[PDB]
Amino acid sequence: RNEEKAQREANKKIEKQLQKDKQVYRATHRLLLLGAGESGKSTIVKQMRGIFETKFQVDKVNFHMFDVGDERRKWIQCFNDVTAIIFVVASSSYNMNRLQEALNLFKSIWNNRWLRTISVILFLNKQDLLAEKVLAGKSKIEDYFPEFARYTTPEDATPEDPRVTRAKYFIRDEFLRISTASGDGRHYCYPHFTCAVDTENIRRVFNDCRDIIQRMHLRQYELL
Amino acid sequence: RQEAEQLKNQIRDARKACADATLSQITNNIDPVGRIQMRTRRTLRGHLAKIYAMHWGTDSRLLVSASQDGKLIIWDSYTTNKVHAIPLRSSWVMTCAYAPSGNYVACGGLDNICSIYNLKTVRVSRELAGHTGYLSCCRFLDDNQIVTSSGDTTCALWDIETGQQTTTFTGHTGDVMSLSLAPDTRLFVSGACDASAKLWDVREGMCRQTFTGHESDINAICFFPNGNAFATGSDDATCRLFDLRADQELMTYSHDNIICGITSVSFSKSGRLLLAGYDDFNCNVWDALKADRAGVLAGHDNRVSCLGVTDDGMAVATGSWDSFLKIWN
Amino acid sequence: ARKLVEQLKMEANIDRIKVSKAAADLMAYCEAHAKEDPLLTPVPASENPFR
Amino acid sequence: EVWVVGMGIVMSLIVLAIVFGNVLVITAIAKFERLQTVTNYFITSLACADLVMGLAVVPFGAAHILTKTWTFGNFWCEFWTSIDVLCVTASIETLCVIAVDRYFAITSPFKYQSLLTKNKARVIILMVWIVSGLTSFLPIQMHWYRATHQEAINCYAEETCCDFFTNQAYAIASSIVSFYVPLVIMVFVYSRVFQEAKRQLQKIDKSEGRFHEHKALKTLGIIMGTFTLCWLPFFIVNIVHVIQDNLIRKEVYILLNWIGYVNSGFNPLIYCRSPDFRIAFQELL
Ligand SMILES: Nc1nc2c(ncn2[C@@H]2O[C@H](COP(=O)(O)OP(=O)(O)OP(=O)(O)O)[C@@H](O)[C@H]2O)c(=O)[nH]1
Ligand SMILES: CN[C@@H]1CCc2c(ccc(O)c2O)[C@H]1O
């Protein structure tokens, strides 16, 4: 008799609480920080200012980053509703092959069935070390990666010796070749060049997330 | 160390000699059950995000579900009104459980920790740690001992009073995805990612038998009500019925029109109907004995990840990524 | 490697029964308990709590 | 004779299409929960307005045109005129609201969720409908709009002829409130949207052009063109026939007014082409 009314009141209270929680849920934007082993993941996170969570806001916008921590990845189906993916790779480890493993990992991530609508932000760390080995060493990418001989810088791209820029563009285009192969217009990639001392990473992520949401909304209305 | 091949050949020869006639041969002449039509009776809403797990209560009245918004909600099926809402420390949960006594609720996820809550006091009671990987499933064996399986190819039996592992089960190669307990709560099985299902002994703590019918990862498993058989589901769109005493499979359920995976498997009270959920946003109802379809449970806009049948077998509940739960009768 | 070798010998020494007996037992159980499942047999609306 | 006959068949076909499209859209929205989005409340309000107009005012107008004599009382003449004005002036502000919603969605992605909520949408729709009905029923049911000319006096006196005669003030006010004000908003909003789309396309081309504005131009072109073509000539002849006496004949006025009514038969063909709507229509007949 009265138990039904008491249960109704409890249901009303629970619904009132859930309605208030929904707003704070919808406000935040989630990200996944996925990088290869030994690829500078620790620094980029540390110098910004079994699992790890990070809270930070830019211009009154809440972001929430997750670092996972298995060669096989069965848990990746749980990350199909994130805003973007931050991929961290060491650009200077082409001889220690670590770079080829990173390329295969990126290819596996891109063409997954459950990640059909997730964009990837690419960070190319260790610019100083790559430049040092490119300019001051007898070893050349040519040996490690053979095709390097044919590629010549894109005429349009900005730039420094004429060899370091060529190497960086070769690496970036080796990634963009996989990037532009499939996926139609559902998701994109935004390559970036980053060193340890760089301080603008938090602004770059903000801009990229804004562009991602803008492009999704534009595509939804048959305008792009 | 070439004797290992000799033992495997011995096992294969014994299994081949054991078989006399197919299951379909014996059960061919029984009458079919005909078309079975099911209609939605209740719809439960209130979850902000997708659902991964659920478990009916032992009284066939209360059920619990866990979503990725980081919240456990205990429903009331009869009057479609909530009772409890428990926030979580971490927002990633992959499993849930309901104690047989109706007093405790457990949940664990991507963090390598199994948590236990005290409904009748709602604050955390214990935190069981020691696994090195994400948890996949957990079942209350009693009010003070719980068995769990994690992603590090191991299973453990815990003690809630002290929070320390009592027995550890090892032997698998790939990740463990599910487990279920026997009707007498003396044995339990497990399905791994190496396409192999094993049968353990809780008291002894040593593996007993192994079945290797499938060709891909196993995502679900459940016992027959009799207690001498169990059926699994895999990524190759096949459900196979094994048997403990004979020690080989008897029947496979497959169709040419399905190429998707399987996420849940359950039986009916009489064991005549086998219910499975697929990635095609709908569930199928199979015939256990004659291996023939008898109905479809459609109505979900996204994939189905959970499914369970009440102890009294009065209804079946399905959960999906569309953040909804439905009760079918 | 001897640990793995021991298990293979251990699992081999179990008595087994023919498929016919197991299939007959399953069919007998399913036919015996067939009259006590609301899913298979549509019960009257009087006893159904979801209507 | 034959002309009278023919007019009928096409008028009945127009009525049937206007009713059928709107009722199908409403049924599809109501039946399925996958379409119960915030943006779909404005669309269902527009669909209800178009359905009400097509079901109420078109048949009686057709009967008046064909029989050349109105067979109901003065009260029903005023009632029909009021419903016509209300529906016409409520079927455009909803399109303005939709344009503003798309503007906010595209230009400010980080604040779209907070700005628009299921609670505020009802307030906006109620405000639009109230302000629409305030300019239709209030000055028509009462006799402010009535004119004092020699023809108008006989028209209001007789119980068989129900024509539209108005003074300058009411016509100008109604036209400005209904059409001219909700046009500059559309133009500004869609100009900004097109500029943003062009900027995004240029960014993509500069980013990954080597390995790899038509759709946006076509979409904005059809959306603006159908509405402007349908409703622009009428809202110019409306002003100019009051500015100058005997400048424009009544027959072309009625023809342009009827051209305006065709617009309600195209909104389902414009705002409801999404894959979800297509699947819903395929499932439901
Ligand atoms: N000179 C230089 N050293 C760098 C730069 N970025 C990273 N390092 C070095 O790389 C080391 C950290 O990278 P790793 O240890 O490979 O990886 P981590 O970031 O520590 O952790 P994981 O990324 O999770 O493996 C530090 O000791 C840094 O000194 C850079 O831009 N310049
Ligand atoms: C009888 N037909 C009416 C006459 C004038 C008028 C219409 C519609 C909207 C207006 O703002 C109007 O002033 C027409 O539908």
Tab-separated table of N, CA and C in Angstrom, chain A residues 26 29 61 63 172-173 176-177 180 188 206 209-211 213-215 217-218 221-224, chain D residues 39 102 105-107 109-110 112-113 193 196-197 200-201 203-204 207-208 211 215-216 219-220:
chain	number	residue	atom	x	y	z
A	26	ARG	N	27.806	15.146	-19.887
A	26	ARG	CA	27.813	15.631	-21.263
A	26	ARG	C	28.822	16.756	-21.451
A	29	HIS	N	34.901	16.141	-22.272
A	29	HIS	CA	35.379	15.479	-23.480
A	29	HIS	C	36.460	14.484	-23.082
A	61	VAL	N	36.741	24.493	-20.647
A	61	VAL	CA	36.335	23.251	-21.296
A	61	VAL	C	37.051	22.101	-20.606
A	63	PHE	N	38.552	18.479	-20.136
A	63	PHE	CA	39.108	17.341	-20.852
A	63	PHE	C	39.528	16.285	-19.841
A	172	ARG	N	56.592	11.666	-41.996
A	172	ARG	CA	55.212	12.120	-41.885
A	172	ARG	C	54.370	11.589	-43.036
A	173	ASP	N	54.923	11.583	-44.248
A	173	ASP	CA	54.188	11.052	-45.383
A	173	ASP	C	54.111	9.535	-45.377
A	176	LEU	N	51.075	9.308	-43.337
A	176	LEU	CA	49.888	9.793	-44.032
A	176	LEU	C	49.476	8.884	-45.182
A	177	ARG	N	50.407	8.099	-45.726
A	177	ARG	CA	50.055	7.136	-46.763
A	177	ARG	C	49.083	6.092	-46.231
A	180	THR	N	45.540	8.063	-45.396
A	180	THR	CA	44.602	8.491	-46.431
A	180	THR	C	44.098	7.317	-47.264
A	188	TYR	N	39.883	11.482	-39.654
A	188	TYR	CA	41.085	12.077	-40.218
A	188	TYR	C	42.255	11.889	-39.261
A	206	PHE	N	43.611	21.163	-28.032
A	206	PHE	CA	42.364	21.920	-27.999
A	206	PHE	C	41.888	22.261	-29.408
A	209	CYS	N	40.710	19.073	-31.291
A	209	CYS	CA	39.400	18.606	-30.847
A	209	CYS	C	38.287	19.492	-31.393
A	210	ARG	N	38.499	20.811	-31.378
A	210	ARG	CA	37.492	21.713	-31.925
A	210	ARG	C	37.264	21.442	-33.406
A	211	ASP	N	38.347	21.237	-34.161
A	211	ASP	CA	38.211	20.930	-35.582
A	211	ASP	C	37.479	19.611	-35.798
A	213	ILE	N	35.179	18.144	-33.869
A	213	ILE	CA	33.746	18.290	-33.624
A	213	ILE	C	33.093	19.111	-34.730
A	214	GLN	N	33.765	20.174	-35.179
A	214	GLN	CA	33.220	20.990	-36.258
A	214	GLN	C	33.030	20.173	-37.529
A	215	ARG	N	34.015	19.342	-37.877
A	215	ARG	CA	33.912	18.538	-39.090
A	215	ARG	C	32.810	17.495	-38.975
A	217	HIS	N	30.033	17.748	-37.197
A	217	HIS	CA	28.760	18.448	-37.336
A	217	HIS	C	28.514	18.872	-38.779
A	218	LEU	N	29.557	19.343	-39.468
A	218	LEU	CA	29.401	19.741	-40.863
A	218	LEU	C	29.010	18.557	-41.736
A	221	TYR	N	25.223	17.324	-41.598
A	221	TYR	CA	24.194	18.136	-42.233
A	221	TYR	C	24.333	18.196	-43.748
A	222	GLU	N	25.129	17.305	-44.342
A	222	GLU	CA	25.339	17.256	-45.789
A	222	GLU	C	25.900	18.581	-46.308
A	223	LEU	N	27.071	18.939	-45.784
A	223	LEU	CA	27.778	20.135	-46.210
A	223	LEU	C	29.256	19.891	-46.477
A	224	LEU	N	29.751	18.681	-46.250
A	224	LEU	CA	31.160	18.378	-46.459
A	224	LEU	C	31.325	16.937	-46.931
D	39	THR	N	16.773	18.393	-32.172
D	39	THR	CA	16.564	19.049	-33.459
D	39	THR	C	15.258	18.614	-34.114
D	102	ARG	N	21.120	25.309	-36.517
D	102	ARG	CA	22.279	24.838	-37.275
D	102	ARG	C	23.453	25.799	-37.138
D	105	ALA	N	25.021	25.113	-33.822
D	105	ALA	CA	25.695	23.821	-33.813
D	105	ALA	C	27.048	23.896	-34.505
D	106	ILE	N	27.126	24.608	-35.628
D	106	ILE	CA	28.368	24.620	-36.396
D	106	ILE	C	29.373	25.602	-35.804
D	107	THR	N	28.929	26.813	-35.462
D	107	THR	CA	29.878	27.859	-35.091
D	107	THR	C	30.464	27.676	-33.696
D	109	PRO	N	30.871	24.659	-31.400
D	109	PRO	CA	30.727	23.231	-31.079
D	109	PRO	C	30.853	22.909	-29.600
D	110	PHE	N	31.675	23.647	-28.855
D	110	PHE	CA	31.910	23.337	-27.451
D	110	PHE	C	30.769	23.755	-26.532
D	112	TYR	N	27.262	23.810	-27.756
D	112	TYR	CA	25.962	23.449	-28.309
D	112	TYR	C	25.136	22.655	-27.307
D	113	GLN	N	25.781	21.758	-26.558
D	113	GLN	CA	25.048	20.917	-25.616
D	113	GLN	C	24.413	21.742	-24.505
D	193	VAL	N	27.573	29.974	-42.309
D	193	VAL	CA	27.769	28.529	-42.415
D	193	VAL	C	28.579	28.186	-43.661
D	196	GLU	N	32.243	29.037	-43.122
D	196	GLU	CA	32.923	28.047	-42.290
D	196	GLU	C	33.218	26.772	-43.072
D	197	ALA	N	32.261	26.324	-43.888
D	197	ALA	CA	32.488	25.123	-44.688
D	197	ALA	C	33.638	25.320	-45.668
D	200	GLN	N	36.943	25.109	-43.784
D	200	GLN	CA	37.321	23.735	-43.456
D	200	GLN	C	37.829	22.989	-44.685
D	201	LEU	N	37.165	23.169	-45.829
D	201	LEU	CA	37.615	22.498	-47.044
D	201	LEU	C	39.010	22.966	-47.445
D	203	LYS	N	41.309	24.101	-45.429
D	203	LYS	CA	42.247	23.520	-44.473
D	203	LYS	C	42.585	22.079	-44.833
D	204	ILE	N	41.573	21.280	-45.179
D	204	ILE	CA	41.831	19.888	-45.549
D	204	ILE	C	42.699	19.819	-46.799
D	207	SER	N	46.169	20.531	-46.008
D	207	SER	CA	46.777	19.507	-45.164
D	207	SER	C	47.190	18.280	-45.970
D	208	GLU	N	46.238	17.636	-46.642
D	208	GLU	CA	46.504	16.370	-47.322
D	208	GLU	C	45.993	16.396	-48.754
D	211	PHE	N	47.762	13.633	-51.697
D	211	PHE	CA	47.319	12.245	-51.781
D	211	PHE	C	45.908	12.145	-52.345
D	215	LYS	N	29.027	20.305	-52.639
D	215	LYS	CA	27.924	19.797	-51.828
D	215	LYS	C	27.298	20.905	-50.990
D	216	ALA	N	28.129	21.738	-50.360
D	216	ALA	CA	27.603	22.824	-49.542
D	216	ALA	C	26.838	23.830	-50.388
D	219	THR	N	23.452	22.260	-51.352
D	219	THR	CA	22.518	22.152	-50.235
D	219	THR	C	21.942	23.512	-49.864
D	220	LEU	N	22.813	24.501	-49.648
D	220	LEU	CA	22.317	25.830	-49.311
D	220	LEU	C	21.488	26.411	-50.446
